Symmetry: C5
């Protein structure tokens, strides 16, 4: 009874990931094929109907279902539209699209995070007893100039056709509240190159050099310098947050910077402690120097165990 | 006499909060159901009319009221439209929408501020004696992994149908100046994680470490250090204000920074006083040291009462 | 002979002030009422015509004049349209609008500047002998919680109907060159809270603390500190300009920064002069210390020039 | 035989200069008048046709030529349209427009640069033997309070109708390859006020104060101070580039900053030279002291010859 | 059987390169000429059809194929449309367009990178047996005064007609696939002026002056100064990244900055080593002094090998 619709989605490009909105842009084609009333075509060859002419055929009573991207944000930019009307009854809708799609995205492991770009297609009006998805084909390019792309795709697209029961609506026998939904996924991983060498590494060097405060001889030298190190961390926090993607939570890099504040605030609490511990007002050079490699180890250890 | 319209609003996604404009984006569906004169439909199943075809039915005189979002800013992006014409007279209008809505939003607290995302629906032309909202149903998705979202929705939507008296009208007829209005609310709180660890805490450490200036031995050491601390607060004010949401008033964080400027400007007025308080311009080591725990408490006291 | 058009403009929201472009967004409704040839209506109650149907009525020869917003920048976003056609001939056009409007705006007194948001309405084709504005009503909401708004609206809107002679025209004969124009104004003042406590005040403290350089004993101490102060003002100059609205001229805050640069550059010219002033090339500690309150007065004097 | 079209372009507002794209926005009206075969209008009075109705008249075979803005970037936002059809044959097209126009713009003399805003109008389909521009009028508003505007328009607009030979074409009779083009010009200058007081002047003071390094007594003082001076120029370089308009080449201010980098790197090369020039490592205080006004003159010289 | 289509693409302006999305804007015209069934035209002169009228002719059964830009991102902004219908059967479609095109772009050699702006044109519905591109002409403005443009075009446009086999397509149907595709290329180079003088050069001076730390006499002077130098690099990394185009990989400039971080961290490791190398804790001035030209050469040697 239900019309069988074969879908094919060509994906050209996924880009423009929005971290805060949890969205991403997808350019590609969508093709839908189904079979209906046989038809007389000019010269008996298949008939082509382009763009504005499709509207005319719909007015004369041509059935073209309103397949909707469930997880798209706002009406997508539909390029050229096309109807291929065959004489043996079948009809093929082919259209190019560019739209912003939504999915749950966890960027907490940034810059070493993995995401999956999802498309979800479903009829807008017709339930599963009226319109059914027969199969889904997804074609992507095998791009291996990987390095220039931010994301390494881990495989061809994985699909999953299913039925979605919508509870609220004015139904009939319990089988008019279900809708056929295509669900496409494309797993990918972020290229951590740029972020390792231009953010992670310099931050390491800066945190490291913060420890060289202990190797200063005088006390005034040690304390006055820590305020300059503190200033440097603030400068670097501004550097990162301004260029790095904005999020509602802390990344790996965000934590390194918090640790820097601590490594310096700790130092300020120690640089100041050695100067007043022992009796006879002696310069407690016994506690410092022990610190000249207690921090370079304590941080390079205790910070090495954040394997959550 | 007035027509009964049953409304149902599905909410898919709330995002894109604009702090200055006091707005926010809402993606979802809207469903309107009413009953009118019965109709003979193809076969006996409900007839479906999608998008451009709905326009034609209205020209032939089908009644479809123009329900307007009162608090939307600019015409919303309407996706797919659908009319389900039942034979028993009913009719169901179903449409996808994405629009920027407005509401009063108080960000004076932050990042611990609470907001409620509001929708207000009302007929554009028909008063309550012509068109009345019978009931309103609001369905939202259950965010289970809310930890990664910016906003945590704290409870289901509250609905409320009411009547609106518009005083300044053209005609009057004492029963033609009232309009039926649906009002949906969704209370929510901001995820304060990122703002606590990456802004609030370091500022505390910096404000704390600012107090360790008094522990410098020389007078020259103490005063020259205060100028580097001053620089750090300016840098940190620039750091926050550039990434934090812009507002026309001071937040909690904005207040901490002003306190930082003062705690440092105060110290400069004290470090400079000790050098000339006692006679003979002696370094008043009796006055300082009293400050080594007057600020860590004085700042931690008078500042502890910010209940404004 | 000319048609009387009674206008009513409901204003919902004014926002999105663009300082460089001198523009602002206005959301609201517009209502125009006039009378023409009587008409046969379905039943005998007034007939309602919404949105797309208005176009069709115009084709059958209904007169609907093209009232234009003179000072709008780009075609405004028109929401729902409505014609209420009464049987006794009169017609009421009601439509919601959101557009970016233009006016002359002086931001020299920032953050204590005052502005008036202006709307200018005028027929596009029909002169004053064809279409005339009878009266104009402008309704605004009573802003109660203005403390959280950026702009405080002072008093209700002032209206102004007038006539404009367009000199250059083709058929003319000084009788077809005049047009009826409604002009609405809304005075408002900027909320100076955020700008006073987070910008004006800290800059004062920094300018104040810049004077505390003179209380340093050594010469090297005084000069080396001045370079850190110079750096601090630059840091603060970047801080302000990045968040403050861009303008083609200097504001109040912008000038304080120039004064800060001067007060520091001046000090550098004295700290350096004292080291070489009178005979014996004496470290003129007789000149400094006299200076420890010459700047705190000199700056509050030469800078006090409330002449601008 | 060729049709005479009289053009009149009212200019309301020029704004939104994009420095990188070399474009600018222009709001205004356009008027085109031509005459053809006389016409029957309801009443012997002129007939007015607004907006959507113009399409209907064109379908019935009314000739309305497609005058195109040659130097516009993307289709302009056309507001209200109007046809004024006179009975004696003449026709007047009136429409409001807002579009982004392109032109060659040299910002090398920034902030003291001069530009000319250009409009170029030409028929899209009809050559000069079919449609010819008779005359061109350009009307601008009286800018009285130009102190608060970004751009000062100097002098009235200059117009110029001309002919353009399009070499590549298909048609025979080689006299169908020329098109009538209106070309409007509007000279204007940038308001150099803000940039002089908030960028140029502080830059002078900062560059000036960099020279005061030579008046430090010790060698350690002079070299260590230069590193703080270096930091200031970088900070000031960041200040400018972030607020100043982005360009693909160096302005006047940009060069002062390069000179600033040099004057400090130069100073470091002299401070370091004096300390090892003479034997026995004696401090060449003759080289310094000569430098106390050699840089204030040497820099005020080499930079004084930027007469490009 | 297949229709011959002669294409001509005029390019007016290439601009607005987006580095992250790897896109660019292109303004220009497109001309397509083909021949079909002859027609009787008004006045027997070639008939011109502009904009909205083109739609009418298509409804009357005029064949106008839907040529698509393969590598465009989103529906392009089509300005004025035109059909020139000759009586002898031939047809010329002419329209202006502005669209954002996509292509592979390698910015690793930035600011010394070379790019090619590509257009790809192909029919949307009709294969090569139905519609074939006969020839392709691409016209650009000659070598003008390119000094003020961001991009210098180094050579004329290269054209290439070809056939593209879609293995996976509609049904299966062999040898009914393959599409005639025009492919335009325009090689260009980036204007390296601004980036050489305002980014590369100061960074050299800053990196150079960092080496002058070794010429400081004391140990405290050298180590404490390195912390000021470190701060300077962070400031410069923020300066560049904020102004420079954002990318997912390291550029040439990005690497220079990494070298800056290292040269300083290295310096801190040597300055600190000399203080503890030789016995009795003597300051190893035998190691330093050699460092006064080990870094200016070592950095320019082992780190400068920009070979591998």
């Amino acid at each position: 009874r239900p019309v069988d619709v074969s879908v094919s989605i060509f994906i050209n490009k996924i880009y423009g990931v929005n971290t805060l909105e949890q969205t991403y842009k997808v350019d590609g084609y969508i093709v839908a094929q189904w079979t209906g009333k046989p038809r007389k075509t000019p010269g008996d060859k298949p008939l082509i109907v382009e763009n504005t002419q499709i509207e005319r055929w719909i007015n004369n009573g041509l059935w073209v279902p309103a397949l909707e991207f469930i997880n798209v944000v706002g009406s997508p930019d539909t390029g050229n539209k096309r109807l291929m009307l065959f004489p043996d009854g079948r009809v093929i809708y082919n259209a190019r699209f560019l739209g912003s799609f939504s999915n749950d995205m966890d960027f907490r492991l940034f810059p070493f995070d993995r995401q999956q770009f999802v498309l979800e297609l479903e009829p807008f009006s017709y339930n599963n007893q009226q319109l059914r998805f027969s199969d889904i084909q997804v074609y992507t390019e095998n791009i291996d100039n990987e390095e220039i792309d931010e994301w390494w795709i881990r495989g061809k697209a994985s699909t999953h056709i299913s039925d979605i029961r919508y509870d609220h609506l004015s139904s009939v026998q319990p089988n008019q509240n279900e809708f056929s939904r295509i669900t496409v996924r494309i797993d990918a991983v972020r290229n951590p190159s740029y972020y390792l060498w231009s953010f992670i590494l310099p931050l390491g060097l800066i945190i490291a050099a913060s420890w060289s405060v202990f190797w200063l001889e005088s006390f005034s030298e040690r304390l006055q310098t820590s305020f300059t190190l503190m200033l440097t961390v603030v400068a670097y926090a501004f550097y990162t947050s301004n260029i790095l993607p904005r999020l509602p939570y802390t990344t790996v890099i965000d934590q390194m910077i918090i640790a820097g504040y601590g490594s310096i605030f700790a130092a300020i609490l120690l640089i100041i402690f050695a100067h007043h511990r022992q009796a006879n007002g002696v310069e407690d050079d016994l506690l410092i120097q022990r610190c000249r490699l207690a921090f370079p180890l304590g941080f390079l250890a205790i910070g090495c165990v954040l394997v959550i």
